[PDB]
Amino acid sequence: DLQQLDDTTQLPLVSHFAETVEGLTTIRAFRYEARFQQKLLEYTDSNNIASLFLTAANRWLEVCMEYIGACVVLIAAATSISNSLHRELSAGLVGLGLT
Amino acid sequence: RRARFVSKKGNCNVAHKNIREQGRFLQDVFTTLVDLKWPHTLLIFTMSFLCSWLLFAMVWWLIAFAHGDLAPGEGTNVPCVTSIHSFSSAFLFSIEVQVTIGFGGRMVTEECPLAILILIVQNIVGLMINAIMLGCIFMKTAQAHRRAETLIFSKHAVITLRHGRLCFMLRVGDLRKSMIISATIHMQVVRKTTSPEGEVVPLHQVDIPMENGVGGNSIFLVAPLIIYHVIDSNSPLYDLAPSDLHHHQDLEIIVILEGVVETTGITTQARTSYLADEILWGQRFVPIVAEEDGRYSVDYSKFGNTVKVPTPLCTARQLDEDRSLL
Amino acid sequence: ERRARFVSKKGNCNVAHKNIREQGRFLQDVFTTLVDLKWPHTLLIFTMSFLCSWLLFAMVWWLIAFAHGDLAPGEGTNVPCVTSIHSFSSAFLFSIEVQVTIGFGGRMVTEECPLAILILIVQNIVGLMINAIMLGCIFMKTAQAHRRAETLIFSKHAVITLRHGRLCFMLRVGDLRKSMIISATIHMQVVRKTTSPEGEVVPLHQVDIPMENGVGGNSIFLVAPLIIYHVIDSNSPLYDLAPSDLHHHQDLEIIVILEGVVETTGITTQARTSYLADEILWGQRFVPIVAEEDGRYSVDYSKFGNTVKVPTPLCTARQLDEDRSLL
Amino acid sequence: RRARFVSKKGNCNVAHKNIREQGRFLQDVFTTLVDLKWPHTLLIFTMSFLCSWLLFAMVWWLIAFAHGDLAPGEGTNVPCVTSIHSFSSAFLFSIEVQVTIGFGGRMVTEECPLAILILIVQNIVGLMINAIMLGCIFMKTAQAHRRAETLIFSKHAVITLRHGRLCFMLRVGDLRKSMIISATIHMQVVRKTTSPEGEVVPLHQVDIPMENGVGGNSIFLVAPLIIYHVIDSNSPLYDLAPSDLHHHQDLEIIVILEGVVETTGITTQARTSYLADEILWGQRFVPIVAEEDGRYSVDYSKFGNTVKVPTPLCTARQLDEDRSLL
Amino acid sequence: RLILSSTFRILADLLGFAGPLCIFGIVDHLGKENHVFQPKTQFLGVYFVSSQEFLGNAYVLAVLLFLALLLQRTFLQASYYVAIETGINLRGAIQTKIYNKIMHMSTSNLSMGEMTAGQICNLVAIDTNQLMWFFFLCPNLWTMPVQI
Amino acid sequence: LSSVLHQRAKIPWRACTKYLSSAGILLLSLLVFSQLLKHMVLVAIDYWLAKWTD
Amino acid sequence: WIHHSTWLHFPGHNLRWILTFILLFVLVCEIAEGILSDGVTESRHLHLYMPAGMAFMAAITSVVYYHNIETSNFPKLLIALLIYWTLAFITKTIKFVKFYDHAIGFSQLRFCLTGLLVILYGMLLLVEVNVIRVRRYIFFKTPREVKPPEDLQDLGVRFLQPFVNLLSKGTYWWMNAFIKTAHKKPIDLR
């Protein structure tokens, strides 16, 4: 959704810029630069704010799995050590597991 | 027989069927004991307190047999509890904890962790068990100071003419010596109706005016009162006659007296009514007051004694219009 | 496109009270909040403290015991700080009796220990207060919890019929409780974003509605659910209103609250209920629920919330005055 | 400055003197402790229990000296208290009883009747000593639950023209989430009135209606509202002039806001007033009610925001007098 | 803001590079067949372990691994978050300055022809986005040699 | 409810249906078999790398 | 057991969570230290295994308090930490002196851990104290006013990763809700 939401929000900001290029003289002629500059912030807010949340979830899903992945190290690591401590597990299995 | 909205003694019986609601929450059970009678409350906690002396005690003996202390002879390990000999004796050991006596002939030592949990296991239980008792006794004692109400009304209803315009009367007299503060007793007439636009009302609820001095619900009761009810043009019984009082009728006058008893400090209510047949047309209430040399005494025993008094046999409209034509 | 309502249909009215200066609160609020807990939640609340009441002070004795040399192996040289206290396990037992007044007997305090003399005092007065608040908590909780249930049922949708010639707004309030609600006063209030004719803008001006009872007062005797016939007229604000502006997009809010006191407890309670324009079905009539049985009066409560249409004029309340004037 | 009938915060400083001798019953002392500060409440019963722990303990150290036990050595004489040796043990002996610890190292025998006299002597006292305090903390349980002031009142008054009609008003809002059941507000003006027969009222109490829709003193608040009291010809304010807005003006208004506290179940009264200096003629309050997707929004900052509006600076009687001409 | 992001990033891999090193130690304690533990010191009847031996325990190194692993990841993950946040804002400022400069530009035929709308469109589209990525990937330039 | 759920369909079968149909069979399993062996060969590298180390 | 009014942050929100976390690492090592020292002697000898094992719980508990003591603004209630940080300085220092009396030196690890512990603990008392310089909750006359963020005042701010605690700053629990509600309700520009 967010990527679709972000990409949809990406179209207007560029489009509003194109209209400004296409109607430059008239926009200045009406001396309504105050209104148009409000729109540029209005558009830029949509793309920028969407990007942050888009970046936010990307970082989170990395973190949540990574820590969940991190335990997979220690859980196996302790398991191998106990096997090597008592069950006489060879270093070969010990070396591979951490690898 | 005829359906009455509220019984003469009160406790209106209405068949409120088609009920879709939660069956019960544990709050009811705590409410149920708290609302029980004194003899019932005494046994219930007595069973509860006795249960603690038994149920937990069962744990000790089983705890005892596990440690093998119950076996005859000097044991190789110090027992979970010193001087525990038999389950019969163990009841004595249990009684010391929940009741907090601690004689000492039984003794609990260390090196028996399972007992340590058990002591805590019943320690919180008994304190909570004792806690309910202090709470339960607190509740039953507070409300029971006002568990009854002794403000009565005349069994029959009386109608007569007062100050030119006829009225329906009633009798107000209470027994408890303490007074009821802020008496606002509103009376209502209930009858079957179909609206002029066709809407049907099996029994509409419309109140009547008590016709007090200030024309308000307020009332100050220190003597047997007769709260009249002026029959006006807007009065529901303005088309009423001394004839339609037969047992087959739609009229139903009910009075509910709000307020709190001064000593009680708690609002109490009393529902009283009188059906069509109960009334006696043209009968005046017996004056029950009499001021003696030193004090004034109320002859309450004749409160319901109805004395017939001559009255016109014309409806309020049939009297006012006749008076208007007069 | 849901529009904010000043009061929820279930009565959970919510208003965003922002720009609020932080009012000072005291720790006694938490103590007050402690009484506000739930019986299962409170059960752990005191128990956790009561358990820590046994342990935390006890640990002081175990520290205290090690000081006077009694904690060491057996030696009759010194006089013990406490009799026969040996291990931190035994430390609990000496305290366990003290907080609970058990007095098992073997673990006995003695003299010649000033710090211990403070132990049997400081931990002593603490326990009495410790049980006191818990005893106090139950004392208030037991009576108050009886009035935590709402058993009054309004009508989810409102109807606009005409009784006694005039059209009057109706609503049926049903009681789900056996206990009576003494001093039943139900006030009907209307809320709108009416800009004043003087010019001022009132965003949520609230206007009460007369109940048109038998004596004109808010007092009512509740036996069976009836209809609060709120007559609409020129004095009533609803004169210029019509079912035309009854859409979900009209700034018209109606509020009714029924004040009263629980007969058993005396605890005053209020019933918050609100209706909007969309939920009201114009030209609907209430279905009677009270049934005439030979034994008692039967309440068809399952039919309370059934809206059935009846011949209802659709002229404007302000305009309906023309029919009387013309005739 | 000028004398005040009620301060803005609600202190309501009134110098009541020339009062006859009050009862000053000793039972009022418990009430003072009942209302005592929680820290003071913490110390008060504690020292009393500490004194109780010692007061009876004072007697015992003498008792041991009497029965010939405090002397060194073991003779034929049975002590008044088993294994009673000195003040330290004696000071422990009381601590066993008054708290019912029951250590057991100090045991009891029937050697001397006064000990049975002593044991009973404090036995009732402790059950009473705890009884006084247990009720004391019980009282403070609901008392702390009060937390009276949880609303707001307008710092200054506003006088705008509502619906074309001249009328004063104020504002108030609730800071707490808990509701105020059965709202009731009464507005009265404390001004130095005079009578035609010479009675110069010192500060006559004249009330003003709240101009609610139902025409009653009842209200309902969930939001910061403005109570508008219609200033008409049937109110003493009909002779007001905006020139009398000085702090030296001989006029004032008092508002009393009763209502059932839903959670507490105890009504709290709001005492407030505004001086003529706080009167801002021709000012209008900026609305703070706002709508949001979740629910309605309230800007508590805008309670004291005032927006000036054109107001005719004449008398309400004169303005109405020209209103007929206009 | 960017410097702190890189500073986090530098210590992120620097702490991270020990990850493989712990494996080297972990095997060695397993690599000693006897693996019999004796601290050989007791100052006051309680044996105290020397530093060089505490960091030789197989189980102890494992605990340090999980603590380091979580610590190494969390700081590393943020380093991307801090930078991408600084860059995302930089898009706004670049765009606003682009739009603000646009409004005051001259509309000559060469200023309209030689500066076509698409070129004006392309710069706002291609350039700032590319500059966004360059900031979005700036620390790796200042970090990749370090880990290398 | 349904609208989110109807949108929330990864559609693996339809994606597999068209993509594999374009793939055919010969190169299809060839992709599967070759990829699996290389990852398997990679894993086997460690075991010998473990064995000689042991 | 709105929210904009419940988001003000005490001074040193970073200097504490950094220091407090820094304590969890070194202290956890001591939890290993007692385990290692108990290997040789046949008796368990928990005298070096229990405290840190108990202490590790405390900082976890203390941190939860700071989050709760900050989520609900009761700056006076920040005395327990003052009464817990201060006392811990007394006990921790004592061990350093007695160990230094026995000529333990830094050759042993435990004295090294304890010496590190004093510095870390010393930061906690000071860092907590600096709050009293700002908020002045007790032992002061005029509590200097504190204001919540102006941006936080509007209810139209949601991606409040900046507006979260340091321990929250990385854990991305700020985005936990917006991730959570997305499972059912579609996410729109509102």
PDB file of C-alpha atoms in Angstrom, chain B residues 121-323:
ATOM      1  CA  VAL B 121      -0.992 -19.974  50.249  1.00  0.00           C
ATOM      2  CA  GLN B 122      -3.443 -19.774  53.144  1.00  0.00           C
ATOM      3  CA  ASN B 123      -2.060 -16.568  54.673  1.00  0.00           C
ATOM      4  CA  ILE B 124      -3.331 -14.381  51.840  1.00  0.00           C
ATOM      5  CA  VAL B 125      -6.436 -16.563  51.559  1.00  0.00           C
ATOM      6  CA  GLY B 126      -7.452 -16.111  55.183  1.00  0.00           C
ATOM      7  CA  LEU B 127      -6.762 -12.379  55.193  1.00  0.00           C
ATOM      8  CA  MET B 128      -8.833 -12.036  52.034  1.00  0.00           C
ATOM      9  CA  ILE B 129     -11.407 -14.409  53.523  1.00  0.00           C
ATOM     10  CA  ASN B 130     -11.476 -12.343  56.705  1.00  0.00           C
ATOM     11  CA  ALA B 131     -11.549  -9.242  54.500  1.00  0.00           C
ATOM     12  CA  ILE B 132     -14.813 -10.270  52.854  1.00  0.00           C
ATOM     13  CA  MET B 133     -16.313 -10.742  56.318  1.00  0.00           C
ATOM     14  CA  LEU B 134     -15.419  -7.239  57.483  1.00  0.00           C
ATOM     15  CA  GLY B 135     -16.750  -5.933  54.183  1.00  0.00           C
ATOM     16  CA  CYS B 136     -19.872  -8.085  54.341  1.00  0.00           C
ATOM     17  CA  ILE B 137     -20.694  -7.049  57.909  1.00  0.00           C
ATOM     18  CA  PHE B 138     -20.029  -3.424  56.968  1.00  0.00           C
ATOM     19  CA  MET B 139     -22.521  -3.517  54.104  1.00  0.00           C
ATOM     20  CA  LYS B 140     -25.352  -5.315  55.901  1.00  0.00           C
ATOM     21  CA  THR B 141     -25.128  -3.011  58.922  1.00  0.00           C
ATOM     22  CA  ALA B 142     -25.172   0.282  57.015  1.00  0.00           C
ATOM     23  CA  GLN B 143     -28.338  -0.202  54.955  1.00  0.00           C
ATOM     24  CA  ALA B 144     -30.225  -2.181  57.615  1.00  0.00           C
ATOM     25  CA  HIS B 145     -30.552   1.029  59.637  1.00  0.00           C
ATOM     26  CA  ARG B 146     -33.187   1.831  56.991  1.00  0.00           C
ATOM     27  CA  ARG B 147     -34.280  -1.622  55.844  1.00  0.00           C
ATOM     28  CA  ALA B 148     -37.994  -0.800  56.314  1.00  0.00           C
ATOM     29  CA  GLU B 149     -40.388   2.067  55.531  1.00  0.00           C
ATOM     30  CA  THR B 150     -43.496   2.917  57.571  1.00  0.00           C
ATOM     31  CA  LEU B 151     -45.311   5.637  55.618  1.00  0.00           C
ATOM     32  CA  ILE B 152     -48.829   4.426  54.877  1.00  0.00           C
ATOM     33  CA  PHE B 153     -51.806   5.672  52.889  1.00  0.00           C
ATOM     34  CA  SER B 154     -55.512   5.036  53.340  1.00  0.00           C
ATOM     35  CA  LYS B 155     -56.688   1.711  51.968  1.00  0.00           C
ATOM     36  CA  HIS B 156     -59.654   3.269  50.163  1.00  0.00           C
ATOM     37  CA  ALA B 157     -59.677   6.458  48.107  1.00  0.00           C
ATOM     38  CA  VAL B 158     -62.052   9.343  48.907  1.00  0.00           C
ATOM     39  CA  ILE B 159     -63.508  12.003  46.600  1.00  0.00           C
ATOM     40  CA  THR B 160     -65.450  15.095  47.681  1.00  0.00           C
ATOM     41  CA  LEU B 161     -65.869  18.824  47.050  1.00  0.00           C
ATOM     42  CA  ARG B 162     -63.454  21.291  48.655  1.00  0.00           C
ATOM     43  CA  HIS B 163     -63.545  25.078  48.245  1.00  0.00           C
ATOM     44  CA  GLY B 164     -66.288  24.900  45.605  1.00  0.00           C
ATOM     45  CA  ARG B 165     -64.522  22.703  43.065  1.00  0.00           C
ATOM     46  CA  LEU B 166     -64.710  18.957  43.603  1.00  0.00           C
ATOM     47  CA  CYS B 167     -61.510  16.980  44.064  1.00  0.00           C
ATOM     48  CA  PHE B 168     -60.161  13.473  44.580  1.00  0.00           C
ATOM     49  CA  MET B 169     -58.462  13.027  47.935  1.00  0.00           C
ATOM     50  CA  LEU B 170     -55.952  10.691  49.546  1.00  0.00           C
ATOM     51  CA  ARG B 171     -54.494  10.116  53.001  1.00  0.00           C
ATOM     52  CA  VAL B 172     -50.832  10.534  53.949  1.00  0.00           C
ATOM     53  CA  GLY B 173     -49.584   9.286  57.308  1.00  0.00           C
ATOM     54  CA  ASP B 174     -46.305   7.743  58.401  1.00  0.00           C
ATOM     55  CA  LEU B 175     -45.317   5.722  61.454  1.00  0.00           C
ATOM     56  CA  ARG B 176     -41.551   6.111  61.903  1.00  0.00           C
ATOM     57  CA  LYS B 177     -40.812   8.883  64.384  1.00  0.00           C
ATOM     58  CA  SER B 178     -37.940  10.277  62.308  1.00  0.00           C
ATOM     59  CA  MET B 179     -39.079  12.636  59.565  1.00  0.00           C
ATOM     60  CA  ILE B 180     -38.573  12.333  55.810  1.00  0.00           C
ATOM     61  CA  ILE B 181     -36.777  15.343  54.346  1.00  0.00           C
ATOM     62  CA  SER B 182     -37.826  16.940  51.044  1.00  0.00           C
ATOM     63  CA  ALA B 183     -41.082  15.117  50.452  1.00  0.00           C
ATOM     64  CA  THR B 184     -42.018  15.480  46.784  1.00  0.00           C
ATOM     65  CA  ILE B 185     -44.883  13.009  46.270  1.00  0.00           C
ATOM     66  CA  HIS B 186     -46.155  13.037  42.685  1.00  0.00           C
ATOM     67  CA  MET B 187     -49.298  11.046  41.878  1.00  0.00           C
ATOM     68  CA  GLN B 188     -50.202   9.771  38.415  1.00  0.00           C
ATOM     69  CA  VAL B 189     -53.323   8.410  36.719  1.00  0.00           C
ATOM     70  CA  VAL B 190     -52.960   5.487  34.289  1.00  0.00           C
ATOM     71  CA  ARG B 191     -55.683   4.492  31.833  1.00  0.00           C
ATOM     72  CA  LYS B 192     -56.093   2.956  28.392  1.00  0.00           C
ATOM     73  CA  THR B 193     -56.075   5.481  25.548  1.00  0.00           C
ATOM     74  CA  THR B 194     -56.130   5.748  21.764  1.00  0.00           C
ATOM     75  CA  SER B 195     -54.746   9.017  20.444  1.00  0.00           C
ATOM     76  CA  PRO B 196     -56.932  11.360  18.366  1.00  0.00           C
ATOM     77  CA  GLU B 197     -54.530  10.680  15.479  1.00  0.00           C
ATOM     78  CA  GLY B 198     -55.077   6.962  16.085  1.00  0.00           C
ATOM     79  CA  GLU B 199     -52.042   5.956  18.154  1.00  0.00           C
ATOM     80  CA  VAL B 200     -53.072   3.389  20.774  1.00  0.00           C
ATOM     81  CA  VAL B 201     -51.754   3.609  24.344  1.00  0.00           C
ATOM     82  CA  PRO B 202     -52.499   0.531  26.514  1.00  0.00           C
ATOM     83  CA  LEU B 203     -51.854   2.622  29.637  1.00  0.00           C
ATOM     84  CA  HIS B 204     -50.506   6.160  29.293  1.00  0.00           C
ATOM     85  CA  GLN B 205     -48.643   7.623  32.275  1.00  0.00           C
ATOM     86  CA  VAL B 206     -49.801  11.133  33.211  1.00  0.00           C
ATOM     87  CA  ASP B 207     -49.392  12.728  36.633  1.00  0.00           C
ATOM     88  CA  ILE B 208     -51.908  14.780  38.612  1.00  0.00           C
ATOM     89  CA  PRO B 209     -51.167  17.972  40.591  1.00  0.00           C
ATOM     90  CA  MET B 210     -50.954  17.590  44.359  1.00  0.00           C
ATOM     91  CA  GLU B 211     -52.484  21.088  44.717  1.00  0.00           C
ATOM     92  CA  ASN B 212     -50.190  22.014  47.585  1.00  0.00           C
ATOM     93  CA  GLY B 213     -49.888  25.628  48.697  1.00  0.00           C
ATOM     94  CA  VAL B 214     -47.019  26.494  46.362  1.00  0.00           C
ATOM     95  CA  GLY B 215     -48.477  24.314  43.594  1.00  0.00           C
ATOM     96  CA  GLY B 216     -45.329  22.212  43.778  1.00  0.00           C
ATOM     97  CA  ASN B 217     -44.406  18.632  44.567  1.00  0.00           C
ATOM     98  CA  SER B 218     -42.984  19.700  47.940  1.00  0.00           C
ATOM     99  CA  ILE B 219     -44.652  18.502  51.140  1.00  0.00           C
ATOM    100  CA  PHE B 220     -43.866  18.731  54.857  1.00  0.00           C
ATOM    101  CA  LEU B 221     -45.313  15.777  56.782  1.00  0.00           C
ATOM    102  CA  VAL B 222     -45.563  15.994  60.568  1.00  0.00           C
ATOM    103  CA  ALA B 223     -49.272  15.160  60.839  1.00  0.00           C
ATOM    104  CA  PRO B 224     -51.703  12.852  59.025  1.00  0.00           C
ATOM    105  CA  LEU B 225     -52.082  14.683  55.738  1.00  0.00           C
ATOM    106  CA  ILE B 226     -54.842  14.556  53.150  1.00  0.00           C
ATOM    107  CA  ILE B 227     -53.150  15.550  49.896  1.00  0.00           C
ATOM    108  CA  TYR B 228     -56.087  16.698  47.772  1.00  0.00           C
ATOM    109  CA  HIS B 229     -56.115  16.917  43.985  1.00  0.00           C
ATOM    110  CA  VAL B 230     -57.993  19.803  42.395  1.00  0.00           C
ATOM    111  CA  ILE B 231     -60.173  18.805  39.442  1.00  0.00           C
ATOM    112  CA  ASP B 232     -59.597  21.444  36.764  1.00  0.00           C
ATOM    113  CA  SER B 233     -60.282  21.782  33.041  1.00  0.00           C
ATOM    114  CA  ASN B 234     -56.937  20.187  32.173  1.00  0.00           C
ATOM    115  CA  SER B 235     -57.423  17.524  34.855  1.00  0.00           C
ATOM    116  CA  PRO B 236     -57.509  13.953  33.474  1.00  0.00           C
ATOM    117  CA  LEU B 237     -60.633  13.156  35.502  1.00  0.00           C
ATOM    118  CA  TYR B 238     -62.423  16.338  34.382  1.00  0.00           C
ATOM    119  CA  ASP B 239     -64.962  14.095  32.618  1.00  0.00           C
ATOM    120  CA  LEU B 240     -65.318  11.744  35.590  1.00  0.00           C
ATOM    121  CA  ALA B 241     -68.501  10.903  37.477  1.00  0.00           C
ATOM    122  CA  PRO B 242     -69.227   9.094  40.756  1.00  0.00           C
ATOM    123  CA  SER B 243     -70.801   6.375  38.564  1.00  0.00           C
ATOM    124  CA  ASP B 244     -67.941   4.898  36.505  1.00  0.00           C
ATOM    125  CA  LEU B 245     -66.231   3.617  39.676  1.00  0.00           C
ATOM    126  CA  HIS B 246     -67.321   0.013  38.932  1.00  0.00           C
ATOM    127  CA  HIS B 247     -64.769  -2.798  38.988  1.00  0.00           C
ATOM    128  CA  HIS B 248     -64.740  -2.632  35.169  1.00  0.00           C
ATOM    129  CA  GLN B 249     -62.898   0.603  34.428  1.00  0.00           C
ATOM    130  CA  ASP B 250     -59.655   1.982  32.988  1.00  0.00           C
ATOM    131  CA  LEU B 251     -58.739   4.482  35.720  1.00  0.00           C
ATOM    132  CA  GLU B 252     -55.646   3.763  37.802  1.00  0.00           C
ATOM    133  CA  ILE B 253     -54.261   6.377  40.200  1.00  0.00           C
ATOM    134  CA  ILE B 254     -50.800   5.714  41.632  1.00  0.00           C
ATOM    135  CA  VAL B 255     -48.735   7.954  43.926  1.00  0.00           C
ATOM    136  CA  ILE B 256     -44.976   7.612  44.430  1.00  0.00           C
ATOM    137  CA  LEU B 257     -43.423   9.632  47.269  1.00  0.00           C
ATOM    138  CA  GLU B 258     -39.745  10.420  46.750  1.00  0.00           C
ATOM    139  CA  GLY B 259     -37.447  11.724  49.465  1.00  0.00           C
ATOM    140  CA  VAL B 260     -34.970  10.529  52.089  1.00  0.00           C
ATOM    141  CA  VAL B 261     -35.528   9.773  55.764  1.00  0.00           C
ATOM    142  CA  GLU B 262     -33.527  12.187  57.913  1.00  0.00           C
ATOM    143  CA  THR B 263     -31.807   9.562  60.065  1.00  0.00           C
ATOM    144  CA  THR B 264     -31.331   7.257  57.071  1.00  0.00           C
ATOM    145  CA  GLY B 265     -29.799   9.835  54.766  1.00  0.00           C
ATOM    146  CA  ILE B 266     -30.826   7.426  51.993  1.00  0.00           C
ATOM    147  CA  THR B 267     -33.662   7.959  49.545  1.00  0.00           C
ATOM    148  CA  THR B 268     -36.653   5.682  50.122  1.00  0.00           C
ATOM    149  CA  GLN B 269     -39.794   5.271  48.046  1.00  0.00           C
ATOM    150  CA  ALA B 270     -43.285   3.947  48.706  1.00  0.00           C
ATOM    151  CA  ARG B 271     -45.725   2.882  45.996  1.00  0.00           C
ATOM    152  CA  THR B 272     -49.411   3.086  46.909  1.00  0.00           C
ATOM    153  CA  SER B 273     -52.543   3.206  44.753  1.00  0.00           C
ATOM    154  CA  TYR B 274     -56.287   2.517  44.709  1.00  0.00           C
ATOM    155  CA  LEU B 275     -58.409   1.017  41.937  1.00  0.00           C
ATOM    156  CA  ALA B 276     -61.857   2.056  40.704  1.00  0.00           C
ATOM    157  CA  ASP B 277     -63.817  -0.071  43.170  1.00  0.00           C
ATOM    158  CA  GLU B 278     -61.663   0.907  46.159  1.00  0.00           C
ATOM    159  CA  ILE B 279     -62.987   4.480  45.999  1.00  0.00           C
ATOM    160  CA  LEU B 280     -66.102   5.670  47.845  1.00  0.00           C
ATOM    161  CA  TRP B 281     -67.841   8.601  46.171  1.00  0.00           C
ATOM    162  CA  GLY B 282     -69.065  11.330  48.488  1.00  0.00           C
ATOM    163  CA  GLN B 283     -67.129  10.157  51.546  1.00  0.00           C
ATOM    164  CA  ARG B 284     -64.943  12.508  53.581  1.00  0.00           C
ATOM    165  CA  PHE B 285     -61.815  11.413  55.422  1.00  0.00           C
ATOM    166  CA  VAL B 286     -62.177  11.124  59.188  1.00  0.00           C
ATOM    167  CA  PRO B 287     -60.363  13.954  61.005  1.00  0.00           C
ATOM    168  CA  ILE B 288     -57.762  11.955  62.911  1.00  0.00           C
ATOM    169  CA  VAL B 289     -55.973  14.889  64.546  1.00  0.00           C
ATOM    170  CA  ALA B 290     -56.748  16.205  68.030  1.00  0.00           C
ATOM    171  CA  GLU B 291     -54.722  18.677  70.075  1.00  0.00           C
ATOM    172  CA  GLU B 292     -54.952  17.814  73.759  1.00  0.00           C
ATOM    173  CA  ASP B 293     -54.016  20.012  76.699  1.00  0.00           C
ATOM    174  CA  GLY B 294     -50.274  19.473  76.323  1.00  0.00           C
ATOM    175  CA  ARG B 295     -49.645  17.697  73.028  1.00  0.00           C
ATOM    176  CA  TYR B 296     -51.540  16.686  69.896  1.00  0.00           C
ATOM    177  CA  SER B 297     -52.496  13.064  69.288  1.00  0.00           C
ATOM    178  CA  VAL B 298     -53.361  11.459  65.944  1.00  0.00           C
ATOM    179  CA  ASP B 299     -56.228   8.949  65.925  1.00  0.00           C
ATOM    180  CA  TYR B 300     -54.605   6.923  63.156  1.00  0.00           C
ATOM    181  CA  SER B 301     -56.880   3.919  63.749  1.00  0.00           C
ATOM    182  CA  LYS B 302     -59.717   5.754  61.963  1.00  0.00           C
ATOM    183  CA  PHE B 303     -57.613   6.904  58.998  1.00  0.00           C
ATOM    184  CA  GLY B 304     -59.512   4.652  56.590  1.00  0.00           C
ATOM    185  CA  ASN B 305     -62.923   5.271  58.170  1.00  0.00           C
ATOM    186  CA  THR B 306     -64.971   6.764  55.337  1.00  0.00           C
ATOM    187  CA  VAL B 307     -67.869   9.019  56.318  1.00  0.00           C
ATOM    188  CA  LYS B 308     -70.372   9.787  53.581  1.00  0.00           C
ATOM    189  CA  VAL B 309     -70.916  13.483  52.872  1.00  0.00           C
ATOM    190  CA  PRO B 310     -73.524  14.930  50.457  1.00  0.00           C
ATOM    191  CA  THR B 311     -72.052  15.650  47.041  1.00  0.00           C
ATOM    192  CA  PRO B 312     -73.392  16.605  43.604  1.00  0.00           C
ATOM    193  CA  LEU B 313     -73.750  13.680  41.201  1.00  0.00           C
ATOM    194  CA  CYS B 314     -72.369  15.713  38.307  1.00  0.00           C
ATOM    195  CA  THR B 315     -69.051  15.460  36.502  1.00  0.00           C
ATOM    196  CA  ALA B 316     -66.488  18.252  36.687  1.00  0.00           C
ATOM    197  CA  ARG B 317     -67.642  19.402  33.265  1.00  0.00           C
ATOM    198  CA  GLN B 318     -71.220  18.509  34.253  1.00  0.00           C
ATOM    199  CA  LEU B 319     -70.717  20.618  37.398  1.00  0.00           C
ATOM    200  CA  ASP B 320     -68.640  23.513  36.051  1.00  0.00           C
ATOM    201  CA  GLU B 321     -70.876  23.873  32.992  1.00  0.00           C
ATOM    202  CA  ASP B 322     -73.906  23.623  35.276  1.00  0.00           C
ATOM    203  CA  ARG B 323     -72.236  26.183  37.543  1.00  0.00           C
TER     204      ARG B 323
END
